[PDB]
């Protein structure tokens, strides 16, 4: 072997120019798409809010058009999924992880138009889904499409142009390039065998998209939280604890997301119409709540800022928590096209802030500011449910910019992943693949 | 297929023993990383108190500078040449081998050698970082526990080896994230699957960072304040700055290698022409660290000043060349210590320069050299050592200017891209290929 290694060392980091140049066109496309989508979604959430003014008087008529508009879209979505691309439902992450493993197909000619216009309806209706799902997937297929249209051959090409389309996609989501790369190489990638994924190709893709996203969403952070205070050394142990808690709760949230995934399968039992109709239902429920207590509906981005700031009361936090835990499952588990990635950040923020308030009054001699805990937690749920801590911590960083809380954010996140292991939890998208992969056999 | 389904359901399950051990490693790695950084400091101090003692008679002082630096430099080169020939130079290439199972981890040797070794080379003012000493001392640390507790299994030997490396790279630049990104983009077996438990690495890194924070709190290694921002029409400029680091990245590789040979002749393997050729360069550095410090020492001290635009165009170039020189000499000379840090300083300085030029060229971009200085700082590390992602994040973790993330990346990528299309190679991989080929021949 030693002589082989010496052969390889001297040949390390040499990616075929074709691969590199293609990772570039991918990232570019992924970006433009990620943009048009984020723009459509926004456009609808707008139209939707312009109809409520039209009928701003008659409260019940308004509460009505809220539900209806959200229902009508949500359905149009669920439909487009159930009817032309059953894969394109739910996350999309678990699916793309499969294709990297060569266990699932990448029917881009389908998913693209489906997941796209699909989530356009689910997100654009105010459902509790992030953009990750829609993009990450749309991203990868993007890369696939180029693979095929240019007929690029070889494992590297199929595995690389698939991985960049994923990262580009996760980047154009949270305008977080590093995270997009850390994601692939800590999660996306074939977790048990060596792979021909050229990191340097990923980068180029990520870059290109981040650049296209910067071309249209400049001067407006998704989450602005300002520079928080600092965290003294004698304050650290508290973020450990906050971690442990996210640790025992991480798996638990996993059971519910999975279990509810089933309990909701009965309601329509595989029937295109009980689905489409059960979707428009949850959908409308959200377009409603997004007017009578928005902090429980929609993406979730909007309340992180408010939460971190200590603007909510203990009561209002808890409520938002539970109400969100509910709306979350309902929309994801229901197999609606969209990520559970973003909404998980929100749950974290809120849960953290709460732990904070308590912390504060408990120890006035620490001079705490709930907002730090809110940030240690923001990505901790992602660390105990989706089990990709390092992608989380860096996903938080890239968006909150409080690198002075690097120690807490880590200790919380680790503490989460450690207890989400010693309580038997599992990588939520791995487990979603194991099911999808095992359900693909069991019926034979 | 059925196998994967078995594995998925079994992903991310690290044996509690492994985890608990990564923890003790990190802790140790830390405390060590601390006592080393403290020794080095202590000596650089003593050295400076002797120059006051003989502060008058200029030549007597220029003398005691050289001598104190020589005397330690030798004491070092000796401890390496005499009891642990592996512990000379970086240490990185070595540890990368052990992960590949192609080299031994003679901790019972390296530990006391590299440790007190660099204590002399660093503590004398040589152009070497702390990475080398620690990264290595780090992994050996993890080896030592492996053995003392008899932990068995690939995972255990590969994991407790990788954490000791990360914990080590962390406590170096108080940069946890980097420490972990390093392992998983560089250190690790580049061509086959491995049993390295990321979650184990973390715990270690943490523990050390926490130990480092217990003693170096409230004092950044590099304070640069919040720099300006970078407009979108200014980006292409950092692409160019990258290309440049791209063609110069390989070239600096040749010199580091080549000078590694041209310095082998001078002593030809002789313990005494080495020890004496080391205290020679060593004394040279303790001298320059008084008649133009910006060419000697770790290099950390001048990044701040550089980024700030406090140096003139002339003074920059000079510090560059002068440093390119002192760098090679100390590393290539196989003295114990990293070329990791001094490569940052070269980056800063090269960037700042590209900046000043940029500024005057385009007053309508309202540039501030300091930004290019930061896009470069780790661009060398991206074109020489070919670990961009570890670099970018290594810079980040220490400059804190996340608003320059786009530049830093485009520079760094542009570096690694041209250091590829101009034939260069991962400097610590090529150093292993040499050390590994000089073994089976």
């Amino acid at each position, epitope marked *: 072997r030693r002589r082989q290694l010496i052969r390889q060392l001297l040949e390390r980091d040499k990616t075929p120019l074709a691969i590199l140049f293609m990772a570039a066109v991918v990232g570019t496309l992924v970006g433009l798409a990620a943009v048009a989508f984020d723009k459509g979604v926004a456009w609808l959430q707008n139209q939707r809010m312009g109809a409520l003014v039209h009928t701003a008087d008659n409260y019940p008529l308004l509460l009505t058009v809220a539900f209806l508009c959200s229902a009508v879209l949500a359905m149009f979505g669920y439909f487009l999924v159930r009817k032309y691309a059953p894969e394109a439902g739910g996350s999309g992450i678990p699916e793309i992880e499969g294709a990297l493993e060569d266990q699932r197909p990448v029917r881009w000619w389908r998913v693209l138009p489906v997941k796209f216009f699909g989530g356009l309806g689910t997100l654009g209706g105010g459902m509790v889904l992030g953009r990750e799902g829609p993009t990450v997937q749309i991203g990868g297929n993007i890369g696939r499409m180029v693979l095929d249209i240019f007929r690029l051959k070889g494992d590297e090409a199929r595995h690389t142009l698939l991985a960049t389309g994923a990262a580009a996609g996760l980047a154009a989501a949270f305008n977080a390039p590093l995270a997009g790369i850390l994601f692939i190489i800590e999660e996306m990638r074939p977790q048990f065998r060596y792979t021909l994924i050229s990191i340097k190709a990923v980068f180029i893709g990520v870059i290109m998209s981040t650049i296209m996203y910067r071309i249209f969403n400049h001067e407006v952070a998704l989450i602005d939280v300002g520079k928080l*205070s600092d965290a003294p*050394l004698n304050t650290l142990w508290l973020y450990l604890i906050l971690g442990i808690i996210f640790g025992i709760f991480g798996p638990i949230f996993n059971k519910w997301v999975l279990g509810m995934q089933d309990l909701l399968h009965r309601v329509h039992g595989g029937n295109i119409t009980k689905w489409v109709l059960m979707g428009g239902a949850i959908g409308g429920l959200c377009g409603l709540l997004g007017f009578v207590a928005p902090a429980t509906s929609g993406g979730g981005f909007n309340l992180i800022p408010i939460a971190t700031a*200590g603007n909510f009361s203990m009561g209002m936090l808890v409520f938002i928590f539970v109400a969100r835990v509910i709306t979350t499952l309902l929309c994801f588990s229901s197999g609606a096209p969209g990520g559970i990635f973003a909404p998980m950040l929100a749950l974290g923020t809120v849960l953290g802030t709460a732990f904070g308030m308590v912390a504060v009054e408990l120890f*006035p001699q620490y001079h705490l500011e709930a907002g730090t805990f809110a940030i240690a937690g923001m990505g901790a749920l992602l660390a105990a449910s989706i089990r990709a801590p390092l992608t989380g911590i860096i996903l938080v960083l890239e968006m909150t910019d409080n690198y002075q809380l690097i120690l807490p954010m880590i200790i919380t996140g680790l503490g989460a992943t450690l207890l989400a292991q010693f309580t038997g939890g599992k990588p939520l998208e791995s487990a979603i693949l194991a099911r999808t992969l095992a359900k693909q056999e069991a019926e034979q | 297929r059925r196998q994967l389904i078995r594995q998925l359901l079994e992903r991310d399950k690290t044996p509690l023993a492994i985890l608990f051990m990564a923890a003790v490693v990190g802790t140790l790695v830390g405390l060590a990383a601390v006592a080393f950084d403290k020794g080095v400091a202590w000596l650089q101090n003593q050295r400076m108190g002797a120059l006051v003692h003989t502060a008058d008679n200029y030549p007597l002082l220029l003398t005691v500078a050289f001598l104190c630096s020589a005397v330690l430099a030798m004491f070092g080169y000796f401890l390496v040449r005499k009891y642990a020939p592996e512990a000379g130079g970086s240490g990185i290439p070595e540890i990368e081998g052990a992960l590949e199972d192609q080299r031994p981890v003679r901790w019972w040797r390296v530990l006391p050698v590299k440790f007190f070794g660099g204590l002399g080379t660093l503590g004398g003012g040589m152009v070497l970082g702390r990475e080398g000493p620690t990264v290595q001392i780090g992994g050996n640390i993890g080896r030592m526990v492996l053995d003392i507790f008899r932990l068995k299994g690939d995972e255990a030997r590969h994991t407790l080896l990788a954490t000791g490396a990360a914990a080590g790279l962390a406590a170096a630049f108080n940069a946890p994230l980097a420490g972990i990104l390093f392992i998983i983009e560089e250190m690790r077996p580049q061509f086959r699957y491995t049993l390295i438990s990321i979650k184990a690495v973390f715990i270690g890194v943490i523990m050390s960072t926490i130990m480092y924070r217990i003693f170096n709190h409230e004092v950044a290694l590099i304070d640069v304040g919040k720099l300006s921002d970078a407009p979108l029409n200014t980006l292409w400029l950092y692409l160019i700055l990258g290309i440049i680091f791209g063609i110069f990245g390989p070239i600096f590789n040749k010199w580091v290698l080549g000078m590694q040979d041209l310095l082998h002749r001078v002593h030809g393997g002789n313990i005494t022409k080495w020890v004496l050729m080391g205290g020679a360069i060593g004394g040279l550095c303790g001298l320059l660290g008084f008649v133009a410090p910006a060419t000697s020492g770790g290099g950390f001290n001048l990044i701040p000043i550089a980024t700030a635009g406090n140096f003139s165009m002339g003074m920059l170039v000079f510090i560059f060349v002068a440093r390119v020189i002192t760098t090679l000499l100390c590393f290539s000379s196989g003295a114990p210590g990293g070329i990791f840090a001094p490569m940052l300083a070269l980056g800063t300085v090269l960037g700042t320069a590209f900046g000043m030029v940029a500024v005057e060229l385009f007053p309508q971009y309202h540039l501030e050299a300091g930004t290019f200085a930061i896009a470069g700082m780790g661009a060398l590390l991206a074109a020489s050592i070919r670990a961009p992602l570890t670099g970018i994040i290594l810079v980040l973790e220490m400059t804190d200017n996340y608003q320059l993330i786009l530049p830093m990346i485009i520079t760094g990528l542009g570096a690694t891209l041209l250091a590829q299309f101009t034939g260069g190679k991962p400097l610590e991989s090529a150093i292993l290929a040499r050390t590994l080929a000089k073994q089976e021949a």
Partner: antibody
Amino acid sequence: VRLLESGGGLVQPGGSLKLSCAASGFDYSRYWMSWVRQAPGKGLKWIGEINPVSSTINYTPSLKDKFIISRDNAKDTLYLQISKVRSEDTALYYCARLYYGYGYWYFDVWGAGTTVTVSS
Amino acid sequence: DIVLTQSPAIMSAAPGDKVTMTCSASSSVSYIHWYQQKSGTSPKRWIYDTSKLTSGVPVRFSGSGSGTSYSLTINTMEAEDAATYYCQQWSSHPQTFGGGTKLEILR
């Protein structure tokens, strides 16, 4: 770094006075400011503290509104209102910027302080 | 709230002498601070976190202690060492101060 507190002086029993502290030589925000007082010939006693955004304001165990610590980061000034002043309030009042090492806070920099005399 | 009691309330020691003052706590404290106050001037952070010297504090000054007993020490107390030293804790809220120890130049 300078802390100049003023406002002190003669106040009639039962009256109220507003002490001021002009800060300069550092970013007034980011810092927790605090008041401490020293009664003639006696020890130091903490009055209270106020965080940067005034979201937290704690006082030594004392009467409900006896003290009112406020701050105006726009003027880099700290304020301490005392009410129902009685002889016990006669003392030198010091404003101090707060900080810490490991985390157990201390009174970083003190000012020269203003003397308050409660008498008729 | 924690009661810090400084042992010698008043003490005299000739220059160049090991001087040691105690700071006992009613309950348990950790990382207490020490302030030096010269007649006519504001207290000055001298020692913090139980033993760290504030920038500018001569090395003859040292402090140590734990749980319920701490002490500030001067290995060879100089003239400009005459002052009142106040210990302070904040390991518990609200922070409290010692009665202080007046260090006077015996002659």
